């Protein structure tokens, strides 16, 4: 119970890897920017920063 | 190792080890909720199931 379940799981848990825009399904990203002026999905999805 | 000034009363040292606390949550069906919580350099479930 150590390092061989940190490194592959970084991508999974969004410590590393792709950001929300390339992670989420395309329909949800089109929705998220159509409603944002009044109901926001921002600050619910993690962007990695490396 | 740390060197501190003398105090005439008992004191504590608060050391914070900065990690990632991933709280991640998913619903796969109505009235069902699931989660997986993972941290990296310090983590729970790293010597028991």
């Amino acid at each position: 119970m150590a390092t061989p379940s940190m490194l592959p799981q970084w991508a999974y848990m969004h410590i590393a890897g792709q950001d929300a825009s390339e992670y989420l399904s395309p329909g949800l990203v089109q929705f998220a920017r159509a409603t944002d002026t009044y109901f926001s999905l921002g600050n619910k999805f993690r962007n990695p920063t490396v | 190792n740390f060197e501190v000034d003398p105090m005439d009363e008992s004191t504590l040292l608060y050391v914070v080890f900065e990690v990632f606390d991933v709280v991640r949550v998913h619903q796969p069906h109505r009235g069902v909720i699931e989660a997986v919580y993972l941290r990296t350099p310090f983590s729970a479930g790293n010597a028991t199931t």
């Binding site: 950001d19 929300a20 825009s21 989420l24 329909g27 949800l28 990203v29 089109q30 929705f31 998220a32 920017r33 159509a34 409603t35 944002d36 002026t37 926001s40 999905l41 921002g42 600050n43 999805f45 993690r46 962007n47 990695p48 920063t49 | 900065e18 990632f20």
Partner: peptide, 26 residues
Amino acid sequence: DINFSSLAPRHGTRPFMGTWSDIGTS
């Protein structure tokens, strides 16, 4: 910093004629 990259999709606002509307999943 102390931890804050917990941000939105990096979209931009949807295109329109007459400043605003709603298109949903389109």
